[PDB]
Design an enzyme around this catalytic site. Structure first.
Site, PDB file in Angstrom:
ATOM      1  N   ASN A   1      55.691  31.449 -74.806  1.00  0.00           N
ATOM      2  CA  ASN A   1      55.653  30.145 -75.443  1.00  0.00           C
ATOM      3  C   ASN A   1      56.419  29.162 -74.579  1.00  0.00           C
ATOM      4  OD1 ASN A   1      58.294  30.869 -75.912  1.00  0.00           O
ATOM      5  ND2 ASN A   1      58.200  30.673 -78.142  1.00  0.00           N
TER       6      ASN A   1
ATOM      7  N   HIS B   1      62.189  34.595 -77.050  1.00  0.00           N
ATOM      8  CA  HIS B   1      60.849  35.131 -77.206  1.00  0.00           C
ATOM      9  C   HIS B   1      60.815  36.240 -78.239  1.00  0.00           C
ATOM     10  CE1 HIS B   1      59.281  32.931 -73.760  1.00  0.00           C
ATOM     11  NE2 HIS B   1      60.467  33.150 -73.226  1.00  0.00           N
TER      12      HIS B   1
ATOM     13  N   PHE C   1      60.305  39.982 -62.710  1.00  0.00           N
ATOM     14  CA  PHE C   1      60.697  39.286 -63.930  1.00  0.00           C
ATOM     15  C   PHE C   1      59.663  39.487 -65.026  1.00  0.00           C
ATOM     16  CE2 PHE C   1      62.230  35.333 -66.138  1.00  0.00           C
ATOM     17  CZ  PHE C   1      63.524  35.759 -66.287  1.00  0.00           C
TER      18      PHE C   1
ATOM     19  N   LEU D   1      66.387  35.897 -71.838  1.00  0.00           N
ATOM     20  CA  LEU D   1      65.308  35.522 -72.729  1.00  0.00           C
ATOM     21  C   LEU D   1      65.585  35.936 -74.160  1.00  0.00           C
ATOM     22  CD1 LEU D   1      62.456  36.688 -70.418  1.00  0.00           C
ATOM     23  CD2 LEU D   1      62.699  34.343 -71.068  1.00  0.00           C
TER      24      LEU D   1
ATOM     25  N   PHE E   1      53.327  38.213 -72.447  1.00  0.00           N
ATOM     26  CA  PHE E   1      53.676  38.766 -71.151  1.00  0.00           C
ATOM     27  C   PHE E   1      54.274  40.152 -71.295  1.00  0.00           C
ATOM     28  CE2 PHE E   1      57.176  36.017 -72.354  1.00  0.00           C
ATOM     29  CZ  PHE E   1      58.228  36.883 -72.339  1.00  0.00           C
TER      30      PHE E   1
ATOM     31  N   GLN F   1      52.203  37.583 -66.913  1.00  0.00           N
ATOM     32  CA  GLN F   1      51.730  36.843 -68.073  1.00  0.00           C
ATOM     33  C   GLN F   1      50.228  36.984 -68.221  1.00  0.00           C
ATOM     34  OE1 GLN F   1      54.083  33.940 -68.989  1.00  0.00           O
ATOM     35  NE2 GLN F   1      52.784  32.715 -70.328  1.00  0.00           N
TER      36      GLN F   1
ATOM     37  N   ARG G   1      49.593  34.760 -64.134  1.00  0.00           N
ATOM     38  CA  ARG G   1      50.913  34.351 -63.674  1.00  0.00           C
ATOM     39  C   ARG G   1      51.723  35.601 -63.411  1.00  0.00           C
ATOM     40  NH1 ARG G   1      55.377  30.749 -66.962  1.00  0.00           N
ATOM     41  NH2 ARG G   1      57.236  31.468 -65.826  1.00  0.00           N
TER      42      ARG G   1
END
Ligand code: IHP
Ligand code: ZN
Lengths: 223, 137, 128, 111, 177, 26, 118, 215, 491
Positions: free
Chosen positions: E102, E126, E60, E122, E113, E63, E55
């Site tokens: 998650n 995280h 940004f 975020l 990531f 992953q 991903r």
């Protein structure tokens, strides 16, 4: 510097006015006897960090209660305008010597607390903590900026410079050279503790006045 | 290496400094004070006398400052007395090079020294006043 | 091309995390004018009372009789706390209408050049 | 010969320099060295002339109010950051006695 | 004397090996020690080898860590998603921060990531347990040089040739089979 | 030794008020 | 005399594509627009208008939007050489530029012109 | 690490350290004297002493959290000095504690820590440790013209002692004595003389204290 | 210095603030020196000017210099100029592409973090060197290998206490590269720093072969030509109201010397005459020549300082062949000198007459690896001094190999610049070379012209120096006309 210190010591001996008077009001006892204060045991560094957080929060509450969103008090206690202010803003947002003195007093205590926070995080050392505290205390002049709101301070500033010269001269005599590492901070520490012995009542009265103008209003009836 | 300087800059800077002392003082005693408060090797007392002389000579008109200052130095120690008898000797012998204003100022300077008796009246030995032995100057 | 790791064990960066980060945008501590004055004073003391060698030891070390001027070292550890000055000291009457009642005595800058300010750029950029 | 005038001159020269500092917004001695006050105007300075950088003579108030003892002590005038030896106006002005003598002599020989 | 390091010191080090070069991860094994212990164990069991970076989002995140590759698998060493561990000196404001991916709260699994820019929204969602050391930040950056077919998957995803542990901070790591 | 010299306070002088002896005294 | 020579050779310096040099001249002159010798200022203004004539309005280096506000205070100058050259330049700009300026600038200039009729 | 009592508001608004720093004067001086010995040894024996940087934290780093950052961390050995169990037997066990003998009812009053009582082996070791912060003279004859009454008299007469302070003057016609033709000048009267004998070498002595000692 | 109307109450009162504002500007490096301490700076609105203190007169002078975003325009203009220098040298440097990062409009004056300005993508690979300065010569391009290269441009405004620009370059290089927020595209690059109040420049970073000389020349030319730097210099001049007196802008041109006597120390070396010989004919009729002592001749142009190493005949003793020996001997001699000198006197550049001597020099100077050695494209007839009887007799009559030191600018430096004094000296030397006899005649104009014992040259007043300068240029042009068959009134 030797003879300026002798002059201070002489004047102290001369101006001794006796205790001359007496009452003993008891503050933290009146506080602890109330339902609103608790008590505990903490680590000096933990109380220091608490005190810096609370001084920050009080000064921000005051700013934003006055609605000056164009001003910003940062975490080292500098007050900064965030844009350029129009005239009505420049006028409504002037602060006085009570606010600025409380700021710079809190700024000095933060510098001391964070010398200790570094030693406790493992970053410096016992010897470098001591040398850095002695730096702070000999150079309160250009670290904080208290003198602009109480120019009488330059008397304490000159005292701590004189003590620096005395102590360095006696320290760096033989093998030791003119480098940094001398930390003997008991002297300048003394000097600023007496400074605060005196300024604490001044600021309590001044800040009471400022808060009571904030919460009741400005009385012009019977000026 | 051991670079051998012959720019002659120590003497030039000595003279520069002496002249700024003279032209910054107010009386000959404040000047003598700044001088005997600077320190130098005894190689330069000769220069002290001759330089205070030339300082005097290049001015526009006399004032007793330079005479009295040299007088204070010679009245402190002898070397100035020695160097000033020598001074009169050579100054007279090579005076023909001075335009009449500086010549007049040298003449006045020596007159002042002689009547203050900082120089011995012997020094007039030098004027063998024949007609031939003496230029018009 | 692809960069080669050093397969090391120690963490990268300054040990003590910068706690003692020295300041330098000025000359080296050995060659500043203060250090030149120190050297020259040392040779002056060495020569004080000796006749001239006619040896050359640099310009700054001629036999200076008349026992400061110059740059100044900053504290290498105090980091000066910088503020932005946002007030432009510009006459608003002049900028708007071309005429100041004060004339040559205006304390403020006579200048009609309208232009974005230092904070409006930040503002529109971060909302852009 | 008027040791009260020399005092006055030191104080007055220093007051006017202090006012130029005051007119800017600082009195810090190192922001305004002498050079910025004493440089000729052809080089951009202010072109001050000076009499307040001299040593003022002193001797013995007690005996001095009686008999003219002389000089024993020298107090300082204004502060030069190092020696710097600023010159005097008095050394470039010529005394009256010598002027009067020069004049008599010049006009005699002009005749 | 003008520039401040604003996070705590690290302890340990993990070396990742990818198609795009190596990636040296230093771990914050006191600020988030379940996450660091879990990463270190999964990386001692070679559980991360031959896994794709499945991903990518421009500027940004990128992953990885799922051994299936669908983007929704993976399992911790605690048989169940474990909890969050935050700190105040660790926050999502730069590139080269490694964090536990998650779907929701308490959800921490085995996926992780990297960031490639400031992700200021975020924070407190995280767990940050590592950062990429100096010279290999750029290899990790190149891990996001792909042409995205949508669902933000790559055309030819990068993958983790092999793992290695340069300094293990725990003493009680015993790896499963 | 303050022997009748120097300002009783070097306040309003425009100096530092240092006093040395006449070095050219004799 | 050097601001004269510019105004004369303002045709060559453009037609040979002097971007460095021509922008040089434009913005250097705009900097000199504060001169306090009327005779020098009149020729500076003549040079500026000589450049505006060859390199048009919409690519002048100090854009007309910065030029005209700089000139409206010069209109009060009462000296004949500078009044001459100033109203020639403002006439060009009002005629051809005319939209790099505000309606309120134009009304200000109206009111300032009513005393060049003297 | 030092643990202090705290008195804090029920809502976090404020917190006061609720105590006074009481210390035993010779213990305290001995502890700083050993500090001085060690810090000189270090400034001598270090190769490059790097003074830390001020402010220690950024302008935008919120003040740290104790629980997250400093709570668990080991505290990093201090500037204690190595006492020799042979000579410093009386002292080895309590020298570097916070409040040295706070709980030993034999040497201190109690737990409010006033009124100490020591033995001479203690006091002698304390003396020897504090030896470098102390003055090596036994009497008063050193401060002969340098004591208080000398400085009080100097101030009241607006004259200065060679090494002593200066102050502003306390307050700020013809005479027939002063005739200089009548004076016998042998030795010049100095400020030391005028201060030693302030009633014989002085006209208008007001508020003059009389120095003399031959101890 | 810079040789009615109906007016309001305030305009017939109140001070005139312009001359106050202009006094503050001229002395502003002293009035605004960094290292006199309150520890609080202030950064002006849209520039990178720091105000140490609170002086509103100074603030308004500076804020009127840098008006209308001139700070960002200087930055963007210099960035363009460099972009195009590379777009020229694309292949010769093996650059594939040159990209210009869209500039955060506040990059030019934000001073605790920085992007990159220019991005050079290589064609193949660059073997990039370890960080070093722009004026340091020796590199070894072994360190890393790279594909991208960034270039960053930092403008400062110095002051009296702090205006060393090399130290600023490496300071910002190390800070910005080891910083953690800094966003660069790769590990390699260069930082170029420009001091706007002193017109100085330097750089620090990683060099890939060819990049160092390219950037040396490109920056030396940007500082002379750039239009935005011109707008700046002329706003400064207009604010001080300074005016030049001299027309023609003296012989300054992109020749090196109006640069060379700038603060970087520079030496001129003349070793063409280490070996010399004169002839006497014998009773054979055979003309036998005898060697005599020579001299290596080292001149510091901006203090007028001439070291003169007298090479005594003894080294002619038995050393197989003379010339290349002289080359190597000269070189080691120069190095011995640089060692014996104090460190604040040591050169950064040496310029040699006989460029073939650069090599033996290059060898021996490994002790001083950052002392760039060039050959002169300006031949200076320094050997003509061997006609001045003082130098000539000293050298002839020397018994020992020995170092001497003269001053060639006797007092001129009291009242002219090192620039004017170098020019005057060059005239004198040229004319003493060309004819030497009518040159003696011109340099002793009047019967009472004299010379003083420590002086090389006559004592004339500035009027006579102007006259005799004119006469020497006429001498030189006359002899060029004679021996090149030209009319000189035509050139
Ligand atoms: O840094 P400053 O505030 O200018 O203080 C320094 C300094 O003291 P700090 O260490 O506290 O910074 C020096 O002492 P060293 O550290 O170099 O030992 C030194 O004093 P010495 O030269 O006597 O050591 C120097 O003095 P100077 O003004 O001669 O440079 C000066 O102390 P001051 O307060 O007297 O200036
Ligand atoms: Zn105005």
């Amino acid at each position: 510097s030797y003879q300026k210190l002798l002059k201070y010591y002489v004047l102290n001996a001369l101006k001794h006015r006796p205790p001359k008077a007496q009452k003993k009001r008891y503050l933290f006892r009146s506080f602890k006897a109330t339902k609103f204060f608790q008590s505990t045991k903490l680590d000096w560094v933990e109380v220091g960090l608490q005190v810096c957080r609370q001084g920050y929060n009080m000064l921000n509450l005051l700013i934003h209660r006055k609605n000056l969103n164009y001003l910003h008090l940062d975490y080292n206690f500098n007050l900064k305008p965030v844009k350029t202010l129009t005239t009505k803003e420049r006028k409504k947002s002037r602060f006085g010597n009570a606010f600025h003195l409380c700021r710079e007093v809190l700024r000095l205590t933060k510098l001391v607390v964070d010398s200790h926070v570094q030693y406790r995080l493992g970053n410096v050392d016992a010897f470098q903590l001591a040398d850095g505290l002695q730096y702070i205390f000999a150079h309160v002049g250009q670290l904080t900026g208290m003198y602009r709101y109480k120019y009488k301070l330059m008397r304490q500033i000159r005292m701590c410079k004189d003590l620096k010269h005395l102590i360095y001269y006696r320290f760096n005599t033989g093998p030791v050279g003119k480098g940094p590492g001398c930390g003997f901070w008991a002297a300048g520490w003394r000097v600023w503790l007496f400074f605060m012995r005196g300024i604490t009542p001044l600021l309590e009265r001044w800040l009471g006045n400022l808060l009571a103008r904030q919460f009741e209003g400005r009385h012009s009836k019977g000026v | 290496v051991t670079i051998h300087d012959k720019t002659e800059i120590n003497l030039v800077s000595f003279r520069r400094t002496i002249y700024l002392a003279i032209q910054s003082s107010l009386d000959f005693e404040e000047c003598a004070h700044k001088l005997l408060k600077m320190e130098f090797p005894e190689s330069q007392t000769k220069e002290l006398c001759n330089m205070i002389l030339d300082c005097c000579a290049q001015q526009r008109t006399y004032e007793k400052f330079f005479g009295l200052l040299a007088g204070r130095f010679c009245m402190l120690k002898k070397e100035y007395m020695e160097s000033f008898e020598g001074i009169f000797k050579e100054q007279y012998d090579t005076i023909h090079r001075l335009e009449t204003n500086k010549l007049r100022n040298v003449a006045k300077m020596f007159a002042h020294l002689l009547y203050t008796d900082s120089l011995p009246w012997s020094v007039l030995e030098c004027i063998k006043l024949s007609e031939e032995t003496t230029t018009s100057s | 091309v692809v960069y080669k790791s050093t397969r090391s064990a120690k963490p990268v960066g300054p040990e003590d995390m910068g706690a003692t980060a020295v300041y330098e945008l000025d000359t080296e501590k050995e060659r500043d004018a203060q250090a030149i004055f120190e050297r020259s004073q040392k040779i002056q003391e060495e020569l004080r009372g000796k006749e001239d060698d006619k040896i050359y030891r640099g310009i700054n070390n001629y036999q200076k009789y008349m026992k400061r001027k110059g740059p100044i070292r900053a504290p290498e550890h105090l980091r000066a706390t910088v503020r932005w000055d946002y007030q432009p000291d510009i006459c608003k009457d002049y900028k708007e209408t071309g005429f100041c009642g004060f004339g040559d005595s205006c304390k403020f800058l006579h200048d009609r050049s309208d232009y974005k300010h230092g904070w409006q750029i930040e503002r529109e950029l971060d909302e852009g | 010969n008027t040791q009260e005038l020399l005092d006055l001159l030191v104080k007055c020269e220093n007051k006017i320099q202090t006012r130029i500092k005051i007119g800017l917004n600082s009195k810090m001695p190192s922001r305004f060295p002498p050079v910025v006050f004493y440089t000729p105007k052809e080089l951009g300075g202010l072109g001050m002339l000076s009499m307040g950088h001299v040593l003022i003579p002193q001797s013995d108030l007690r005996w001095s109010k009686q008999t003219d003892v002389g000089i024993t002590h020298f107090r300082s005038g204004m502060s030069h950051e190092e020696d710097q030896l600023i010159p005097n106006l008095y050394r470039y002005i010529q005394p009256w006695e010598s002027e009067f003598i020069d004049s008599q002599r010049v006009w005699a020989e002009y005749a | 004397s003008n520039i401040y390091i604003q996070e705590p010191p690290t302890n340990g080090k993990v070396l990742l090996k990818t198609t795009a070069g190596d990636i040296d991860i230093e771990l914050w094994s006191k600020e988030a020690p379940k996450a660091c212990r879990n990463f270190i164990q999964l990386c001692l069991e070679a559980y991360y080898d031959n896994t794709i970076f499945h991903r990518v989002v421009p500027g940004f995140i990128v992953q990885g860590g799922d051994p299936t590759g669908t983007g929704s698998g993976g399992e911790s060493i605690y048989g169940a998603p474990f909890k969050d561990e935050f700190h105040s000196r660790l926050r999502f404001n730069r590139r080269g921060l490694v964090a536990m991916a998650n779907a929701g709260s308490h959800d921490n699994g085995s996926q992780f990531f990297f960031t490639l820019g400031r992700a200021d929204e975020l924070n407190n969602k995280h767990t940050i347990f590592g950062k990429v050391t100096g010279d290999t930040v750029y290899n990790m950056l190149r891990l996001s040089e792909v042409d995205i077919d949508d669902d933000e998957r790559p055309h030819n995803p990068h993958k983790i040739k092999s793992c290695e542990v340069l300094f293990n901070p725990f003493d009680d790591i015993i790896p499963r089979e | 030794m303050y022997n009748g010299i120097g300002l009783p306070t070097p306040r309003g002088s425009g100096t530092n008020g240092y006093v040395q002896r006449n070095l050219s005294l004799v | 005399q050097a601001a004269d020579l510019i105004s004369r050779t303002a045709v060559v310096m453009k037609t040979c594509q002097e971007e460095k040099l021509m922008g040089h001249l434009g913005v250097v002159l705009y900097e000199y627009l504060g001169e306090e010798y009327p005779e020098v200022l009149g020729s500076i203004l003549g040079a500026l208008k000589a450049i505006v004539n060859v390199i048009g309005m919409h690519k002048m280096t100090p854009p007309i939007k910065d030029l005209l506000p700089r000139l409206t205070p010069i209109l009060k100058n009462r000296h004949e050489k500078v009044q001459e050259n100033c109203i020639d330049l403002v006439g060009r700009i009002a005629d051809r530029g005319a939209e790099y300026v505000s309606a309120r600038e134009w009304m200000r200039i109206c009111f300032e012109l009513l005393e060049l009729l003297k | 690490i030092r643990d202090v009592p705290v008195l804090y508001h029920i809502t976090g608004a404020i917190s006061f350290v609720n105590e006074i720093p009481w210390v035993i004067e010779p213990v305290y001086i001995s502890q700083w004297g050993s500090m001085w010995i060690m810090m000189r040894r270090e400034k001598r024996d270090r190769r490059h002493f790097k003074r830390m940087r001020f402010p220690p934290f950024d302008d935008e780093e919120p003040p740290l959290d104790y629980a997250d950052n400093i709570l668990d961390v080991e505290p990093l050995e201090a500037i204690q000095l190595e006492l020799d169990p042979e000579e410093d037997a009386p002292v080895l066990d309590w020298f570097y504690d916070h409040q040295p003998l706070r709980d030993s009812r034999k040497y201190v009053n109690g737990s409010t820590y006033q009124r100490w009582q020591f033995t001479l082996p203690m006091m002698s070791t304390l003396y020897r440790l504090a030896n470098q912060l102390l003055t090596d003279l036994v009497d008063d004859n050193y401060f002969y013209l340098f004591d208080l009454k000398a400085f009080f008299t100097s101030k009241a007469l607006n004259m200065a002692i060679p090494g002593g302070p200066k102050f502003e003057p306390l307050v700020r016609d013809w005479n027939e004595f002063n005739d200089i033709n009548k004076i016998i000048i042998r030795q010049p009267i100095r400020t030391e003389y005028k201060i030693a004998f302030p009633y014989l070498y002085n006209n208008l002595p007001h508020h003059v204290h009389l120095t003399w000692y031959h101890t | 210095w810079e040789k009615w109307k109906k007016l309001t109450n305030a305009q017939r009162s109140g001070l005139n603030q312009i001359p106050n504002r202009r006094f503050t500007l001229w002395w502003s490096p002293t009035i605004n020196r960094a290292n006199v301490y309150v520890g609080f700076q202030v950064q002006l609105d849209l520039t990178g000017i720091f105000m140490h203190g609170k002086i509103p007169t100074l603030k308004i002078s500076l804020i009127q210099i840098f008006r209308a975003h001139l700070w960002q325009k200087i930055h963007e203009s210099i960035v363009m100029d460099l972009c195009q220098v590379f777009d020229q040298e694309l292949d010769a440097l093996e650059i594939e592409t040159v990209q210009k990062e869209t500039i955060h409009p506040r990059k030019s004056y934000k001073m605790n973090s920085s992007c990159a300005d220019i991005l050079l993508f290589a064609s193949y690979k660059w073997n990039v060197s370890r960080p070093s300065l722009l004026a340091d010569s020796k590199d070894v391009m072994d360190s890393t290998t790279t594909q991208k290269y960034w270039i960053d441009i930092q403008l400062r405004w110095g002051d009296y206490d702090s205006h060393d620009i090399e130290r600023y370059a490496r300071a910002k290089f190390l800070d910005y590269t080891t910083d953690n927020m800094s966003i660069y595209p790769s590990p390699t690059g260069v930082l170029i720093a420009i001091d706007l109040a002193y017109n100085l420049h330097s750089a620090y970073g990683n060099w890939f072969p060819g990049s160092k000389p390219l950037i040396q020349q490109a920056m030396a030319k940007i500082m002379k030509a750039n239009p935005a730097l011109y707008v700046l210099r002329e706003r400064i001049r207009k604010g001080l109201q300074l005016y030049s007196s001299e027309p023609t802008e003296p012989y300054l041109s992109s020749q090196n010397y109006g640069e060379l006597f700038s603060n970087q120390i520079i030496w001129f070396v003349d070793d063409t005459n280490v070996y010399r010989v004169t002839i006497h004919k014998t009773f054979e009729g055979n003309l036998t020549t005898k060697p005599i002592n020579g001299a290596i001749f080292i001149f510091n142009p901006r203090t007028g300082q001439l070291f003169l190493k007298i090479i005594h005949t003894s080294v002619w003793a038995g050393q197989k062949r003379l010339g290349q020996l002289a080359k190597w001997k000269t070189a080691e001699e120069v190095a011995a000198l640089i060692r014996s000198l104090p460190v604040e006197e040591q050169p950064k550049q040496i310029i040699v007459t006989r460029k073939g001597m650069l090599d033996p020099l290059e060898v021996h100077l490994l002790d001083f690896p950052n002392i760039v050695i060039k050959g002169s494209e300006l031949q200076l007839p320094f050997q003509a001094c061997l006609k001045v009887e003082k130098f000539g007799d000293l050298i002839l009559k020397a018994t020992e190999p020995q170092m001497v030191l003269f001053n060639l600018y006797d007092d001129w430096l009291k009242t002219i610049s090192s620039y004017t004094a170098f020019s005057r000296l060059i005239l004198i030397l040229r004319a003493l070379h060309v004819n030497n006899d009518r040159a003696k005649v011109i340099l002793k104009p009047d019967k009472t012209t004299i010379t003083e014992p420590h002086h090389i040259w006559p004592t004339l007043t500035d009027e006579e120096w102007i006259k005799v300068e004119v006469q020497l240029k006429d001498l030189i042009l006359a002899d060029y006309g004679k021996k090149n068959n030209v009319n000189v009134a035509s050139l």
